[PDB]
Design a protein around this ligand. Sequence first.
Ligand code: HEM
Ligand SMILES: Nc1cc(OCc2cc(-c3cccc(F)c3)ccc2Cl)c2[nH]nnc2n1
Ligand SMILES: *[C@@H]1O[C@H](CO)[C@@H](O)[C@H](O)[C@H]1NC(C)=O
Ligand SMILES: [Ca+2]
Ligand SMILES: [Cl-]
Ligand SMILES: [Cl-]
Lengths: 464, 103
Amino acid sequence: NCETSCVQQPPCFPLKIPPNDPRIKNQADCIPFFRSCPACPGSNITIRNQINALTSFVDASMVYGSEEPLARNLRNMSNQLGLLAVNQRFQDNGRALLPFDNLHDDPCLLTNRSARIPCFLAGDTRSSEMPELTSMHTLLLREHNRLATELKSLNPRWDGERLYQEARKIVGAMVQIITYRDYLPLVLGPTAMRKYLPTYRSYNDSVDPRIANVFTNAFRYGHTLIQPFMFRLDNRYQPMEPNPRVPLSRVFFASWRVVLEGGIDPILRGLMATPAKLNRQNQIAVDEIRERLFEQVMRIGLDLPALNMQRSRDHGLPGYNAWRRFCGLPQPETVGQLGTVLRNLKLARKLMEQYGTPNNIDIWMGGVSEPLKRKGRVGPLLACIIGTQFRKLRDGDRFWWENEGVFSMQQRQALAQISLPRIICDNTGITTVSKNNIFMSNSYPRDFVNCSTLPALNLASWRE
Amino acid sequence: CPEQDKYRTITGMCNNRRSPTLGASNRAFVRWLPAEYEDGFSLPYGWTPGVKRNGFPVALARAVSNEIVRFPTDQLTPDQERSLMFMQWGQLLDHDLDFTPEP
Ligand code: HEM
Ligand SMILES: Nc1cc(OCc2cc(-c3cccc(F)c3)ccc2Cl)c2[nH]nnc2n1
Ligand SMILES: *[C@@H]1O[C@H](CO)[C@@H](O)[C@H](O)[C@H]1NC(C)=O
Ligand SMILES: [Ca+2]
Ligand SMILES: [Cl-]
Ligand SMILES: [Cl-]
C-alpha cells in the first residue's frame, strides 16, 4: 500500500519528512516509495539485486519493445507494408501520432479531466511521461514508417517482416550514430571521450554488454539539465501564445497537450531553440522536479533527487568513496580534502553536515556535485561510470552499426550522413532546424539552417 | 540460438552467442561492486532507526535534497553551449537502456 501508507513494511520504503521542511509541514506524512522488484524473491542466500526490464543495447527498444507480445502489438499487421501502428482517433496536421494504451489506472486522463486523452503506447512504458519525450517517440515512429515506405518502392517484392526489420535496423543505427557521434562527446568532454571511448575497432564477444546497477542511478545526472518549463515555438520560432512557457508540474503525463495543443512541431522547436539548464553546485535541480514531480496525478508531489538517493539505498549501492576507488580516483576523507575534490568548500561543508563522511555520500549526490569536465557536462566520477557503460554497450554489441557484416561499406557511408535535424525535416512540418551539432545549437536564428541545405539518407545501397 | 541471423531479437536474446541472455530484457543487472545493505543481503541503509552506515547516522534523502539540491527557481543558469534537446535525447536514450520494475 505504498501509494497511500506511511508504515515501513515490504515492499514500501517511504521517504520520511525532516523537521522544518519547505513544503511538507506534516512529519507523519512521507514521500511514497516502492522498493524495486528483487531478481530473486524471498531469498536467504543471494545478495538482493534488481532487474532490467529492457534490452541493454542501443537498438531503439523504446520504439520497438523489449518483449515479443508488446513488439507484435506495436506493429501494423493489417498489411505487408512493414509499418508501426499509429493512432486511429487523432493526427498531428495529417501526420501520425503514437497509438493510445489501455491502462487500468491511466495517469494521463488525470492531467486534464475534460479532455479524456489517455497515455500513449510505445516500446517503453514511459512515452507519455513528458510531451518532449512523447515528441521524440512520435518522431522515431514516423521515421520507421517513412523508411519502410521508401524501402517498399525500392524493393517491391519485400514482405512486411523484411520491411519492418530493415527499417528497424536503420532506426537502431541512427540512434547509435546520434548517441556516439553527437551526444556522448558533449556529455563527457574530449579527454573522457578519448579515455573511455577510444576509436571503435571491432565486436568483442568477451565484453559484458549488461547495464550495471550503478548506471541506473549515475545516468540520472540528466536531472540537473531539466528546465522548469515546457517551451513551445510557432512557425517563426517565436513564443506560441497562449501558454508558450507551461510549468513542468502541469506537463507530466499531459498526453492531451500533444493531441489538443498543436502536436509535436512546437515542442521540437522549443527543444532545439531553448538552452538546457546548466548544472551548478548551488543550482543542482529545479523545484518542478524536487517539489512538484507528478503533483497532479498523485496524492503528493514527489522529490526526484530524494528518490534518486533513496533508490540507490534500495539498490544497495556503495557510497561516493567506494565509487571513486573503483574509478581509480582519490577518496577524500575530510571536509578540506572534499573541498579540494569539489573545488568548493561551501558544498563540501553542506555534504559533511548531511553525511558525516565522504564514504556515505549517495552516488547521484556525489556525482552531480563534482565540477564539470572541460567541454563536458559531468565530473570525473560520472564520466567514468557513464563512459565505462557506453564502451561496454558498443564493444559488446554484435549488431553494432560499424561491426563487419552488420551493414555494407556503402550502407555504412550512407548512414554516416544521418542527423537528428534531418529526421525532424523528414517527419514534421518544420522547415528550419538546428545546425549540427543539434545538442550545442540553441539560439534562433544564429544556429539554425533551412532543411533544403541538409542532404537526406540515401537508401540506394538497400536495393536488391 | 541460431548459427545464422540477419537481425536483432526483440529481447536481446542471442546477441552474445557464448552467454545468450547478456543484454537481454527481464534479467538481473550486473554489479561492478558488491552490494551494501544494513543486514548485508536485503535491507537498505536507513531502514532500521539507529543503525549507522560506516560510523555515521544515515541522512534522510529528503533532508539532503532540501539542504543541498534546493535553489530558488528564478536564478536558473541557462547553458550557453547546450539545447534542451541535449536533456531530451538523454532521457530518450535512458529509455532504450534501462527500466527498473516495481511491485
Ligand atoms: C523530462 C523529465 C524527466 C522526468 C520527469 C524523469 C523522471 C524520473 C523518474 C520518476 C524516475 C524514477 C525515479 C525513482 O528512482 O523512483 C526516473 C528515473 C531515471 N531517469 Fe529521470 N526523468 C527525466 C529526465 C531524465 C533525463 C534527462 C535522464 C538522463 C539524461 C534521466 C535518466 C533517468 C534514469 C536512468 C532513471 C532510472 C531508470 C530506470 O528505471 O532504470 N531522467 N526519472
Ligand atoms: N523507473 C521509472 C519510472 C518512471 O515512471 C513510472 C510511471 C508512473 C506512473 C504513475 C501513474 C499514476 C500516478 C503516478 F504518479 C505515476 C505510470 C506509469 C509509469 Cl511508467 C519514470 N519516468 N521517467 N523515468 C522513469 N523511470
Ligand atoms: C495500417 O496501415 C494502413 C495503410 O497505411 C492504414 O490505413 C491503417 O490505419 C494502419 N493501421 C494502424 C493501426 O496503424
Ligand atoms: Ca535497448
Ligand atoms: Cl488508438
Ligand atoms: Cl553496480
